[PDB]
Design a protein around this ligand. Structure first.
Ligand SMILES: *[C@@H]1O[C@H](CO)[C@@H](O[C@@H]2O[C@H](CO)[C@@H](O[C@@H]3O[C@H](CO[C@H]4O[C@H](CO[C@H]5O[C@H](CO)[C@@H](O)[C@H](O)[C@@H]5O)[C@@H](O)[C@H](O)[C@@H]4O)[C@@H](O)[C@H](O[C@@H]4O[C@H](CO)[C@@H](O)[C@H](O)[C@@H]4O[C@H]4O[C@H](CO)[C@@H](O)[C@H](O)[C@@H]4O)[C@@H]3O)[C@H](O)[C@H]2NC(C)=O)[C@H](O)[C@H]1NC(C)=O
Ligand SMILES: *[C@@H]1O[C@H](CO)[C@@H](O[C@@H]2O[C@H](CO)[C@@H](O[C@@H]3O[C@H](CO[C@H]4O[C@H](CO)[C@@H](O)[C@H](O)[C@@H]4O)[C@@H](O)[C@H](O)[C@@H]3O)[C@H](O)[C@H]2NC(C)=O)[C@H](O)[C@H]1NC(C)=O
Ligand SMILES: *[C@@H]1O[C@H](CO)[C@@H](O[C@@H]2O[C@H](CO)[C@@H](O)[C@H](O)[C@H]2NC(C)=O)[C@H](O)[C@H]1NC(C)=O
Ligand code: CA
Ligand code: CA
Ligand code: CA
Ligand code: CU
Ligand code: CU
Lengths: 619, 611
């Protein structure tokens, strides 16, 4: 039984932006091994969401919270919560006797997490009390700190490993930030250039976990996975904040099971709720007070689908060569070489012994559930990468060492141990960056790799529908005209990517600059894009090089794609062998689809897949 | 189609039958060229779970007005939101509609969107427009949307029509387009019709709060108790934007009034009348109560919120309040309290506890118990004695009224006299199955409703199936005995600042139960479980009350709430509190200067005395 946490008050700088930059010195809470400073003060990945918030001090029913506390700012503070409880006393006093801690001073609070500090039979596997610094109930708190404590019943939160995990936890805390009433000259005086009306509203943030306007970060969601929310609210009388989870509803328990779609935080109240986001994507969660919204207090939870996963094409076409980058590789084993690419001498990236980084520009920010690593042989001597960490970013400005689950400073991943390794490493929780770097830690006499990261797109789309997967009927597929001869019958039905057999492709009876291949999706659908192809049949090779796309929601009316004003020419596949893919930047969405070849090499012929995601039937 | 609706957005003018023009929600069969009680509301749309709706809003407006849903499922089509959701065109299309643009919405009543079954049938949500909320909603961009248990509407033909949609709204008319508004469904001064209900049959309120600023309300119904959470509410506390499904029993007949009760709110509106008529008929020992007796009186005396350390002058935060200075009258003022008086007519029962300050006698009510307030106005100005909480209050011996006047609380105010009163308790007045027992109540002197109270007359009434903490604010300035106070403590005899900021709020003490910064200390021995009946009165703005001791303390209203309780002011609810805590306790006024100005108090951890 029992849990200790090593927690402390830091003075640090707060910014937002992304729109003169306002720089503020508030004081927050962080947790580290017990090495006072240089090491180790680290937390990250999933926990972004707390932001200003101190870390999750989670305990169980029964067991103890021990909480060491170190102040590191000019004016003494104190870790206090409701449950800073048993202090039996002996002619020594109780309440003011451990009241506060001077800078650098160091105190441990330790109590028994009684039943009266707990969730009831009336449900929710965890509660959500709060820790503040008393001494100044308002002053320091506004300026600096707030912490979310949560106790859960018995066999509830995971042994050794973290806390909970059955379900995802989030402590969004809603408040108005007045500043000025918080911290003084070092805060107040900075950016000097005058008491209430002039810019007073300017100091006031209306901020979730201290992120005004849409700044809040960590909302890895995950379709169909119970999510507990922690809504502890605070401040002065203005903040009755009526939080709303855009087109989601949740339940709460309190002697019964009530459903509701917005609940109001009376400063001090906190609370807990559970919901499961049935539909994935981006969405808002905001206080719905009109004034309070346009002053900030809105953020987006960015829920993904699990069944989304696909290669981003480091193997295939979609990824172009310019996309990659390296420490600079000794040997000509230049990057531009990754995954399955065995050609002649050269099939991978490969630097010398000094520490390296293969970074990847995805050309867009994107979610990524995992990477598949590779190594190659040369001259008998086995080349691979044994162990590595992933770094990622969005703008190339920020960078981040990825932790995911892994207890401590980060997760190191286990690479292959041979040439032709194929190690699917997995990123749940998953990365969001546009930029994935890769630093190796161990190798075998050299560093070297082929790789093909797999993720899905920021929205939970970009996936194949029928066609290849055969899930779309060759009753469903039609086309303008087809090449049918005794035996060979280049039916529209055969326009399915990577299909090998008799008559394995589509062909129009004889060629025309304007033909068409069509797919009766049946359901009204969205389309991310289209993977296109070509076929060789008996030593004669043939493929479609240029093409045009129709679509209709209308059985008999069609509307040509139009791009940047003009209708657009689609460039893909210089060959039969390979398939290559087109983005479809503004995604046309229809029930029925059509495709018209322009430049067709030798002879017209097509196999393909479509890309996409389901949207509502009957509309 | 499962069900479908057509909305408009028409710009119409409004008189609140002052004239104002507004762009509000409208409905038709399919384009073209209601029921009055609804008035302003964009039509109340409602769906059973599983069955799913579609609007096709036509923006027959100047404004580009969007359609957000607040409590169903969408696809980025249904919600009217533009925000960096990386969905692009056709999917932001209805995520904010253009002027003159007639565009279409889709939404679903998902099995999970539905009520819990511990919940009431039909959970009240609404809709609006998520395109500049303040520039929107004002001018009429709010309707009511309700989702209900599946075999739902089929019943309505069988079921009660007693489904009224109460829209409590602070339209800052002077947005989207001079001073504010306070309406109830879009009427101001007791305006508006409908609001009829059956006699012995109960009525249900589909309640919608409406803000666009931190604006708060507390809304009663003339002698009527509310049912919401299945705990009697008696108050319908209503936050900036809330959704509440409440019900009202509707005993008796005629015209009673719901209304926002606060300060300046009534001078702005928010009150409206609810008729009950009789209705068309259509058939297809060891136990029991005893009655309470109280010889009680309103006597007058000076009140000193003391004494602890007096910290003079430079303590320009502390002392300014309770120090006799050139223009100040600290600590002691002349008041009137209720006493149960010891030596007089109909003998007595009188001994005082320091622990409740001004607080009157505590009067205890068990359902079906009766009360016998043999009241006399012992001192000065004529004062009244009425209990907020109970209902059957008529002088004993007669249902007649002093011939002269309406509802005793109103007038017969007894200046040197004695009046005999009967407070019969019904179960109606009492706590439900769900609410904890001994719900907190108070009684005042309704010589008007407020003016005297401030003076110092107040006490605690428990209704039940006894530590009391009243927070209160004593204005002193509106107190009857101000002339008698100014001319008793201040240095210059009479002539002095008539009124001023400097002294005004310097003679408004923040009470702690009419006790000041530190007082009471209180006498609770460790491990003793208490019941803590607490209440705010005096001045208003929400309340934030907490216990902060050698165990901080936690308490249970059902599920245990922590360094928090929130009496709405002119309002009250009560608390169980296991005491395995410890000594010296910040006891919370908790909020703003409220904290700096008057909060404190303490708690103990003694033990070893038994009986
Ligand atoms: C890093 O941290 C993250 C979280 O921060 C963790 O990743 C998470 O891992 C857990 C556990 O490994 C994952 O949960 C798993 O989910 C699968 C399948 O999902 C379930 O839910 C789906 C939706 O249905 C919902 O509604 C159902 C009621 O209608 C309800 O039952 C269900 O729970 C859902 O709420 C649906 O596909 C299924 O219903 C499915 O159940 C599940 O199969 C996993 O296993 C269960 O384990 C319990 C406890 O032993 C058993 O009682 C069940 O019967 C399941 O048995 C499974 O394991 C046994 C072997 O023990 C095996 O024989 C059997 O075949 C099952 O496989 C499990 O619950 C969660 O989704 C991950 N979350 C995230 C965000 O990644 C990890 O700790 C860590 N992970 C990594 C990869 O590094
Ligand atoms: C709804 O009912 C309200 C009252 O129940 C009505 O309010 C009152 O009526 C009008 C509109 O406000 C006012 O008419 C004039 O107002 C002045 C000044 O008002 C007060 O505030 C100023 C501010 O400095 C103060 O100086 C004054 O002393 C007042 O206290 C009055 O002095 C005039 O007599 C005059 O009546 C009333 O003032 C206002 N009430 C009060 C208390 O003044 C409202 O009109 C109704 N609205 C509708 C739509 O029906
Ligand atoms: C606690 O905090 C202060 C910082 O204000 C401490 O000063 C530092 O002490 C550590 C010793 O480990 C050194 O690393 C630094 O050189 C010191 N910083 C300075 C002098 O600026 C100090 O130890 C404590 N403060 C007091 C007042 O005793
Ligand atoms: Ca839309
Ligand atoms: Ca949108
Ligand atoms: Ca009065
Ligand atoms: Cu708000
Ligand atoms: Cu009001």
């Amino acid at each position: 039984k029992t849990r200790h946490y090593f927690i402390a008050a830091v003075e640090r700088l707060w910014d937002y932006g992304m729109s003169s930059v306002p720089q503020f010195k508030k004081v927050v809470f962080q947790e580290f091994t017990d090495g006072s400073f240089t090491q180790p003060l680290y937390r990250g990945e999933l926990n972004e969401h707390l932001g200003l918030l101190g870390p999750y001090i989670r305990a169980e029913v029964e067991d103890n919270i021990m909480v060491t506390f170190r102040n590191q700012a000019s004016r003494p503070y104190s870790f206090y919560s409701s449950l800073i409880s048993y202090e039996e006393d002996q002619r020594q006093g109780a309440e003011p006797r451990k009241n506060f801690v001077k800078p650098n001073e160091t105190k441990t609070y330790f109590w028994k997490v009684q039943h009266h500090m707990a969730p009831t039979k009336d449900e929710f596997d965890c509660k959500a009390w709060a820790y503040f610094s008393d001494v100044d109930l308002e002053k320091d708190v506004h300026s600096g700190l707030i912490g979310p404590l949560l106790v859960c019943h018995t066999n509830t939160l995971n042994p050794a490993h973290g806390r909970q995990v059955t379900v995802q936890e989030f402590a969004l805390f809603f408040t108005i930030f007045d500043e000025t009433k918080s911290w003084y000259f070092t805060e107040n005086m900075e950016r000097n250039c005058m008491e209430d009306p002039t810019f007073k509203e300017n100091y006031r943030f209306h901020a979730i976990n201290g992120y005004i306007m849409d700044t809040l970060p960590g909302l890895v969601m995950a379709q169909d996975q119970r999510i507990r929310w922690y809504l502890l609210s605070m401040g002065s009388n203005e903040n009755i904040h009526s939080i709303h989870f855009s087109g989601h509803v949740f339940t709460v328990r309190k002697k019964e099971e009530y459903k509701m779609a917005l609940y109001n935080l009376y400063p001090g109240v906190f609370e807990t709720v559970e919901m499961l986001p049935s539909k994935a994507g981006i969405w808002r969660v905001e206080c719905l007070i009109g004034e309070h919204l346009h002053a900030g207090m809105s953020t987006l939870f960015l829920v993904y689908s699990n069944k989304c996963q696909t290669p981003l094409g480091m193997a295939s076409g979609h990824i172009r060569d310019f996309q990659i980058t390296a420490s600079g590789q000794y040997g000509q084993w230049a990057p531009k070489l990754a995954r399955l690419h065995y050609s002649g001498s050269i099939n991978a990236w490969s630097t010398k012994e000094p520490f390296s980084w293969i970074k990847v520009d995805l050309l867009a920010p994107m979610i990524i559930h995992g990477i598949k690593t590779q190594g190659a042989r040369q001259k008998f001597s086995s080349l691979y990468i044994s162990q590595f960490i992933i770094m990622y970013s969005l703008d190339g400005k920020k960078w981040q060492t990825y932790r995911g689950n892994s207890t401590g400073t980060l997760m190191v991943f286990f690479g292959n141990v041979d040439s032709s390794g194929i190690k699917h490493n997995i990123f749940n929780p998953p990365i969001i960056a546009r930029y994935i770097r890769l630093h190796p830690t161990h190798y075998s006499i050299r560093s070297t790799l082929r790789m093909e990261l797999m993720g899905c797109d920021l929205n939970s789309c970009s996936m194949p529908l029928g066609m290849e997967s055969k899930a779309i009927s060759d009753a469903q597929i039609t086309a303008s005209s087809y090449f049918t001869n005794m035996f060979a019958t280049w039916s529209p039905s055969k326009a399915r990517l990577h299909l090998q057999g008799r008559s394995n492709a589509w062909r129009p009876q004889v060629n025309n600059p304007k033909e068409w291949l069509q797919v009766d999706f049946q359901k009204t659908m969205k389309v991310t894009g289209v993977t296109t192809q070509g076929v060789k049949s008996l030593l004669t090779s043939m493929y479609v090089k240029e093409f045009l796309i129709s679509s209709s929601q209308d059985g008999h009316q069609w509307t040509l794609f139009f791009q940047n004003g003009k209708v657009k020419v689609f460039q893909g596949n210089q060959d039969s062998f390979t398939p290559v893919v087109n983005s479809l930047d503004p995604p046309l969405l229809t029930r029925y689809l059509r495709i018209h070849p322009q430049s067709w090499v030798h002879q017209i012929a097509l196999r393909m897949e479509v890309l996409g995601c389901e949207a509502q039937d009957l509309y | 189609a499962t069900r479908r609706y057509y909305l408009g957005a028409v710009e119409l003018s409004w008189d609140y039958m002052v004239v104002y023009k507004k762009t509000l929600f409208v409905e038709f069969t399919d384009h073209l060229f209601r029921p009055p009680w609804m008035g302003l509301l964009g039509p109340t749309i409602q769906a059973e779970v599983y069955d799913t709706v579609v609007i096709t809003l036509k923006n027959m407006a100047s404004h580009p007005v969007s359609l957000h849903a607040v409590g169903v499922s969408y696809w980025k089509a249904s919600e009217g939101a533009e925000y960096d959701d990386q969905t692009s065109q056709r999917e932001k299309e209805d995520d904010k509609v253009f002027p003159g643009g007639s565009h279409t919405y889709v939404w679903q009543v998902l099995k999970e969107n539905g009520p819990m079954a511990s919940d009431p049938l039909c959970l009240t949500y609404s809709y609006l427009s998520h395109v500049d909320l303040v520039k929107d909603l004002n001018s009429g961009l709010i309707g009511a949307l309700l989702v209900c248990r599946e075999g739902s509407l089929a019943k309505e033909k069988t079921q009660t029509l007693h489904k009224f949609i109460l829209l409590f709204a602070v339209f800052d008319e002077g947005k989207s387009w001079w001073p504010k508004m306070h309406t109830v469904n879009g009427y101001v001064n007791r305006s508006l019709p409908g609001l009829i209900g059956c006699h012995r049959k109960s009525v249900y309120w589909h309640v919608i709060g409406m803000g666009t600023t931190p604006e708060v309300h507390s809304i009663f119904l003339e002698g009527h108790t509310f049912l919401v959470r299945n705990h009697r509410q008696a108050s319908l506390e209503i936050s900036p934007i809330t959704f509440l499904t409440a019900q009202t029993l509707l005993m008796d007949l005629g015209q009673f009034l719901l209304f926002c009760h606060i300060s300046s709110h009534q001078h702005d509106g928010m009150e409206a009348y609810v008729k009950v008529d009789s209705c068309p008929e259509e058939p297809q020992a060891k136990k029991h109560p005893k009655t309470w007796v109280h010889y009680i009186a309103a006597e007058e005396e000076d009140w000193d919120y003391a004494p602890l350390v007096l910290a003079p002058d430079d303590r320009s935060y502390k002392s300014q309040y309770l120090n006799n200075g050139p223009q100040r009258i600290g600590r002691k003022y002349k008041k009137v309290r209720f006493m149960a008086y010891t030596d007089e007519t109909f003998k007595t029962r009188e001994a005082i506890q320091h622990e409740s300050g001004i607080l009157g006698p505590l009067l205890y009510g068990e359902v079906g118990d009766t009360l016998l307030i043999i009241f006399k106005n012992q001192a000065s100005r004529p004062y009244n004695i009425y209990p907020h909480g109970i209902t059957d209050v008529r002088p004993l011996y007669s249902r007649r009224l002093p011939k002269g006047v309406k509802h005793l609380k109103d007038f017969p105010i007894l200046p040197g006299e004695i009046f005999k009163y009967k407070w019969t308790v019904t179960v109606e007045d009492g706590p439900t199955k769900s609410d904890p027992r001994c719900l907190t109540r108070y009684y005042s002197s309704f010589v008007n409703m407020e003016r005297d109270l401030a003076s110092g007359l107040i006490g605690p009434l428990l209704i039940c199936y006894r530590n009391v903490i009243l927070f209160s604010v004593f204005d002193e300035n509106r107190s009857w005995y101000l002339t008698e106070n100014i001319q008793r403590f201040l240095p210059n005899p009479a002539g002095v600042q008539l009124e001023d900021p400097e002294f005004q709020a310097s003679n408004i003490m923040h009470s702690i139960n009419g006790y000041v910064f530190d007082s009471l200390q209180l006498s609770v021995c460790l491990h003793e479980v208490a019941y803590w009946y607490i209440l705010s009165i005096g001045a208003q703005t929400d309340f934030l009350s907490v216990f902060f001791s050698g165990y901080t303390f936690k308490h249970k209203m059902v599920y245990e709430d922590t360094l928090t309780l929130f009496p709405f002011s002119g309002e009250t609810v009560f608390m169980s509190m296991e005491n395995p805590g410890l000594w010296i306790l910040g006891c919370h006024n908790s909020d703003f200067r409220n904290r700096g100005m008057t909060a404190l108090l303490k708690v103990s951890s003694c033990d070893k005395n038994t009986g």
